[PDB]
Design a protein around this ligand. Structure first.
Ligand code: NAP
Ligand code: DWJ
Ligand code: MG
Ligand code: MG
Lengths: 416, 416
């Protein structure tokens, strides 16, 4: 009799991560846990077949069941439209889901005692709090075909003020233009999530913007964070001997680089994307990073791997060549999802299982069994030999064996 | 004798950088070089007095004389408006100048063998080619006060059509919105500058975008770079055994982090700003970096010191206290400017002088003569003693002495 897991929304994906996703369910989840699994295939072919309706339905299912576990998916471009003979260049499924759910994507490296960093000073963790709504990820962009005016207008519903601003008057040739926005309520939830995360970890909080350039747009993020801090969190930060400060983004990335870690970094959507990949790599690998969307309701989460479909690696699998893809981030999407499901259901057995799989994953790497990427952290990529790492399947087998052992010993450890 | 320098546009700046800028002219340039100097004071008080007209005039002077050297300037915020009792919160002078001139700002670290990197693998240089025009630095942003529609419109100059895109319909509360653009011709010049830089250095070229998200806006940068490569540069890259690749920005930053350097990184305006500060800091010190704007005409340049005005030291200097200000980036703005002036005028003596001052600066630090910041990079700030560094004036004197020596030995080396 397996553990009673409960209701979980799973989103199947593409390429290398799709392969890995099936191996994880079969070898690490299904032998030990029984779930009411709400499966949505977000594979590029199924999104094309359903005119991207499957993505909207999966997002609505997460709203209802409170816990999502998502596989990395292809965001189609011109080359992808050609490859899969798509009806349209479908929008990012992550963007669709995040737009519907809202919240903050909290990203952090998965640390192993034997893995060396690329950044010497990072002795404490860096938690990135990426705002999951608006800006470039819900923008309107277009090609300007030739000379003419691009204007941006605001028309109040309950006002008079049709305000028209000239963006640019193209006098010779064309180019490109775009409009983007953000919402006060979403910014307020992002500020609250950031202050709360810093207080739960007991670390200082830094918000990065470019308010010297985008005086109104970024100035608003700065003003909302400062206002919420002064009125609702300042005394709490002072009590834990921590602080909150705004920094310019270019200063912030340089500060982070020369720091020792141990802080929460509130990032605007775009910066959170870019810098989350820099922080994961700085600590060792993109395969070694947790990614959880924490919704503003405080009950709903969508767990995923911060990295993508690992297309480069999938192209090697396609050629029947050997692959060594790190499945740890994909595994931690399941464990973080199951841990949240356990917390909602007060399921001590599911919570034990979720944590045990995380320990098994870290212990296996710490025991010297790892994928090529992690072996390159220790030895340097040119000094890496076949004997130093395990392939994708080999690594999954070792994890399955170690998981079986950890769960057997835990059961035996139970006293009368 | 004195080297006939020629026509150079200089832009004076603010705080500690303004002091250091003067020490440089007096001790390192004026004793050896005679210049037709076109001086524009871009200090915050003079920009206020001229309603920022001095900035536009300096930019027009650079267009005319083809070479400009710029000191670091204050971009005023609310606290700066209060401090200097400004009439307005003046726009960034760098933004104004770059908007008028156009081109690409090439950023590269200034390497000293004895200064430790924070990024272990960077054994070869990373050259960031920052597109200097448009996007966030020529944007129109505003606060949305409440419910209502934000739209962006395009009207061709013939007035025979009008395209209206909905950016967002605010239904509850307000937020923020912005319009930004770029121009095809500016993108084309950025692509050419990037391919040419890679071919002159003999390194591969990488362009970073977020074209999976901004399909039209970033897709255009991607299409223009790919088109120009295939038609005008591919055979040249193949001949030097180098390549041109497009990567997504978040992938790119992770790639750069784990690389060994030795590539050209074509960055969009914003990414260039952020990542050049991450890279400069990764090599050792933020202020150990060159920043040269190469204009599309292939004749005009603006070299600058792309760091802050060092307020913390300026305060100490005002109080008659001891300061230890790194002047290297400000020195290299002069040497890169003078080297370009020499190249335009076929002045072998000016070219020799420009290079000699660069060698002198690197050799002095490498000989163990440096400012507090660099001493902290080697020993760590708590382990730094007064004997480990030189003050602002002491460091300038050492460079002046070493420059006098290098130039005397070079004159003696001339055969009868
Ligand atoms: N959450 C998501 O659904 C998500 C996120 C990002 C991207 N994407 C999509 O994924 C596709 C490919 O994206 P991308 O190549 O830009 O980004 P990516 O999949 O994160 O991978 C880029 C590179 O990072 C390394 N890497 C990433 N995950 C790894 C892992 N688990 N183990 C080892 N190495 C790993 C590899 O480096 P080396 O090649 O040097 O080994 C890989 O080629 C695109 O269609 C994109 O839209 C989706
Ligand atoms: C300089 C110093 C002195 N004297 C001091 O006491 C600090 C307040 C100070 C902090 C900021 C700063 C910047 N620099 C630079 O010289 C510089 C110049 C150009 C680009 C980047 C940096 N020095 C300092 C001070 C410092 C910094 C670090 C360690 C010791 C002193
Ligand atoms: Mg990303
Ligand atoms: Mg900057």
């Amino acid at each position: 009799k397996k553990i009673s897991g409960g209701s979980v929304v799973e989103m199947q994906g593409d390429e290398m991560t799709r392969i890995i996703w099936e191996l994880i369910k079969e070898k690490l989840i299904f032998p030990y846990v029984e779930l009411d699994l709400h499966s949505y295939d977000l594979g590029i072919e199924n999104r094309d077949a359903t005119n991207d309706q499957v993505t909207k339905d999966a997002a609505e299912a997460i709203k209802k069941h409170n816990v999502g576990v998502k596989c990395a998916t292809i965001t189609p471009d011109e080359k992808r439209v050609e490859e899969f003979k798509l009806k349209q260049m479908w929008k990012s499924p992550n963007g669709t889901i995040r737009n519907i759910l809202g919240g903050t994507v909290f990203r952090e490296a998965i640390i192993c005692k034997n893995i060396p960093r690329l950044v010497s000073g990072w002795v404490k963790p860096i938690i990135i709090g990426r705002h999951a709504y608006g800006d470039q990820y819900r923008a309107t962009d277009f090609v300007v075909p030739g000379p003419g005016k691009v204007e941006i207008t605001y028309t109040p519903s309950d006002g008079t003020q049709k305000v028209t601003y000239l963006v640019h008057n193209f006098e010779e040739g064309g180019g490109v233009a775009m409009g983007m926005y953000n919402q006060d309520k979403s910014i307020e939830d992002f500020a609250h999530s950031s202050f709360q995360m810093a207080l739960s970890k007991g670390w200082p909080l830094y918000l990065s913007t470019k308010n010297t350039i985008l005086k109104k747009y970024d100035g608003r993020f700065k003003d909302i964070f400062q206002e919420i801090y002064d009125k609702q969190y300042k005394s709490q930060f002072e009590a834990q001997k921590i602080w909150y400060e705004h920094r310019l983004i270019d200063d912030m990335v340089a500060q982070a680089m020369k720091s020792e870690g141990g802080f929460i970094w509130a990032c605007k959507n775009y910066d959170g994307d870019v810098q989350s990949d820099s922080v994961a790599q700085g600590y060792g690998s993109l395969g070694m990073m947790t990614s959880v969307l924490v919704c503003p309701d405080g009950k709903t989460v969508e767990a995923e791997a911060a990295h993508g479909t690992v297309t480069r690696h999938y192209r090697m699998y396609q050629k029947g060549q050997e692959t060594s893809t790190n499945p740890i981030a994909s595994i931690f999407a399941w464990t973080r999802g199951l841990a949240h499901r356990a917390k909602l259901d007060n399921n001590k057995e599911l919570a034990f299982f979720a944590n045990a799989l995380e320990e098994v994953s870290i212990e296996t790497i710490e025991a010297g069994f790892m994928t090529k990427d992690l072996a390159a952290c220790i030895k340097g990529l040119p000094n890496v030999q076949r004997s130093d790492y395990l392939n994708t399947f080999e690594f999954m087998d070792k994890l399955g064996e170690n998981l079986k052992i950890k769960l057997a010993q835990a059961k035996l450890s139970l006293e009368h």
